[PDB]
């Protein structure tokens, strides 16, 4: 499936570091159901022109962008092309590449349990459940003290993005190891057909 | 701004002087791939993705030509106004649980980067390492600045301290982000 790119319109002609940035965002709500398409032209951290499918045409965001916006909306071949990208790019890429790529990626998490400081029965300690290398983001981690789910004393980091299409999250559980106790870490993720559970006998 | 999924396509960045360009595709905040302007090919982050989907390199080259031109125009149209430098922050953390004597990846996440021209290098015991170092492209941020990630392949030794050294015009001197197993 060939990925389609948003095209940038050429600007009308009229130490010191300058940065120009173009981009076409495609917001998909409820799959392909609702789609909003926005392209932004940015000069030095400043968005000076843009196309919003909710508006139906280029609109300068600052005086620097009036020339461009004026011109692009005048030539029918340019406005109609940009305007069509909502189907030409967004919808196409979503129903094609994405659907067969990121939209179906499932990476089961690896979970392990660790004790912060060395174990000393009848002494407070910390239990950490590390859930790593999973995808997509949606995930649930629950702690269990031999049978029953505990929420108090439980603390979790925020979703950490590894940058290579995987996430990780850490979940601490404050507790004190008493012989005969069994702590288990439950993790539910879309990639698993059945919840994963790691045990740690005190 | 509110959506189950966001696909940013054709992200083109260009800067002067030096003619430094970048062309990438992202999805839900992850790079699908980028186009090497020199080798003139498409590099997919997840190689398994390039098997299923493709993208002709010509597309990025062509789009970089436009953006290159627009910078020229917009530069003059504003009396050559300089970009305001920013101070980039760093954060270091392991890709998976640290287990001595076991291959792992140390990650350096640099945020608030602008302009998108930076040097991120590692240091083992203040000795500087250059092997097993992969770097991502610049990712876009809502406030129009960027972030990048650097990865370091390493084996957690008992006593070897690492540092993510960052060099940016927004800093009077490099900032070292320290990370230690214990």
């Amino acid at each position, epitope marked *: 499936f060939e990925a389609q790119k948003a095209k940038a319109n050429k600007a009308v002609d009229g130490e010191r570091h300058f940065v120009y940035q173009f981009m076409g965002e495609c917001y998909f709500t409820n799959g392909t159901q609702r789609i909003r398409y926005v392209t932004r032209y940015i000069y030095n951290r400043e968005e000076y022109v843009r196309y919003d499918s909710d508006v139906g045409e280029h609109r300068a965001v600052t005086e620097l962008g009036r020339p461009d916006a004026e011109y692009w909306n005048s030539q029918p071949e340019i406005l109609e092309r940009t305007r069509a990208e909502l*189907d030409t790019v967004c919808r196409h890429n979503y129903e094609g590449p994405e659907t067969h790529t990121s939209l179906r990626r499932l990476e089961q998490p690896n979970v392990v349990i660790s004790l912060s400081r060395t174990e000393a029965l009848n002494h407070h300690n910390t239990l950490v459940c590390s859930v790593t290398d999973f995808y997509p983001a949606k995930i649930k981690v629950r702690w269990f003290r031999n049978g029953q789910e505990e929420t108090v004393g439980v603390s979790s980091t925020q979703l950490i993005r590894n940058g290579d299409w995987t996430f990780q999250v850490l979940v601490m559980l404050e507790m004190t190891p008493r012989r005969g106790e069994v702590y288990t870490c439950h993790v539910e993720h879309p990639s698993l057909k059945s919840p994963i559970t790691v045990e740690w006998k005190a | 701004i509110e959506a189950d999924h966001v696909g940013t396509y054709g992200i083109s960045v260009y800067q002067s002087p030096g003619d430094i360009g970048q062309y990438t595709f992202e999805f839900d905040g992850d790079e699908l791939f980028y186009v090497d302007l020199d080798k003139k090919e498409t590099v997919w982050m997840l190689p398994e993705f390039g098997q299923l989907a493709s993208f002709d390199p010509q597309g990025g080259l062509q789009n970089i*030509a436009v953006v290159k031109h627009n910078l020229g125009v917009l530069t003059k149209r504003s009396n050559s106004t300089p970009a305001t430098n920013e101070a980039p922050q760093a954060t270091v953390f392991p890709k998976s649980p640290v287990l001595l004597g076991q291959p792992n990846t140390l990650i350096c996440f640099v945020d608030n980067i602008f302009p998108p021209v930076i040097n991120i290098t590692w240091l083992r015991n203040s000795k500087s390492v250059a092997d097993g170092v992969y770097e991502t492209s610049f990712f876009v941020n809502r406030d129009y600045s960027f972030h990048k990630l650097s990865y370091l392949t390493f084996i957690p030794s008992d006593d070897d301290i690492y540092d993510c050294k960052v060099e940016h015009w927004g800093l009077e001197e490099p900032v070292l982000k320290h990370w230690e197993p214990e």
Partner: T-cell receptor
Framework: AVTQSPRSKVAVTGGKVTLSCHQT?????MYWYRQDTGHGLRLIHY???????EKGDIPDGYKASRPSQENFSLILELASLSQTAVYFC???????????FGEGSRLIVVE | DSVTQTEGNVALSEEDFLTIHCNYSASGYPALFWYVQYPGEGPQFLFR?????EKGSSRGFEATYDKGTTSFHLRKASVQESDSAVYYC???????????FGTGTRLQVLP
């Protein structure tokens, strides 16, 4: 807009021909198509930048040169009987997708 | 990834109904065109359609972008004898800005 040269040209097999194309529309993209009844228009080479070129569907037997952004040359180092056709040069605005052809350059290759 | 025109040669009396079928195959969501070439010159732009259900028209000629049956059939109510020429169906691969042409249909409008 786009003018072609020569309007026509007879050549001997093995001979070297050069079809030149000039454009005023001030476009980045310039193409070269060959026309022959039973095949419509097929792309030989195309260019979007002042120093490069790219192959189309049937570039075999041809070379192109984009010295400037308004001049695009099509070269046949060694004429062939199967290269007898009508060559059309065209252009497009990088921000558009509409082609602008020239009058054409008929080329006959005799034995 | 190409374009196909059903006919290849059409002849009819002035004031008749004209219909030239055109079907396509693309990897993306291409912009569909129609070009016309009058005897003794290059092909020129007629009109376009950037997406499904959209309608392109000009000089009496019109076509509707049909993504469903991947079509773009040309049509005119009453053809005039000055419409005799070659009509091409085109397609634009937006990623590399290449334009694929159909075979072309020759239209003969008997006065």
């Amino acid at each position: 807009a786009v003018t072609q040269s020569p309007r026509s040209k007879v050549a001997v097999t093995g001979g070297k021909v050069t079809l030149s194309c000039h454009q005023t529309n001030n476009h980045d993209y310039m193409y070269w198509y060959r026309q022959d009844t039973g095949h419509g228009l097929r792309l030989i080479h195309y260019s979007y930048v002042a120093d490069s070129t790219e192959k189309g569907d049937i570039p075999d037997g041809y070379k192109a040169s984009r010295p400037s952004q308004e001049n695009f040359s099509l070269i046949l180092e060694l004429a062939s009987l199967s290269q007898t056709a009508v060559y059309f040069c065209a252009s497009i605005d990088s921000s558009g997708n509409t082609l602008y052809f020239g009058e054409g350059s008929r080329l006959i290759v005799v034995e | 990834d190409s374009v196909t025109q059903t006919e290849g040669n059409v002849a009819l009396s002035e004031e008749d109904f004209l219909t030239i079928h055109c079907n396509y195959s693309a990897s993306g969501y291409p912009a569909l065109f129609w070009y016309v070439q009058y005897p003794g010159e290059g092909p020129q732009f007629l009109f376009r359609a950037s997406r499904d259900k959209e309608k392109g028209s000009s000089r009496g000629f019109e076509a509707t972008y049909d993504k469903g049956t991947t079509s773009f059939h040309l049509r005119k109510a009453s053809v005039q004898e000055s419409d005799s020429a070659v009509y091409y169906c085109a397609l634009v691969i937006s990623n590399t800005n290449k334009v694929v042409f159909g075979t072309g249909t020759r239209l003969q409008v008997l006065p």
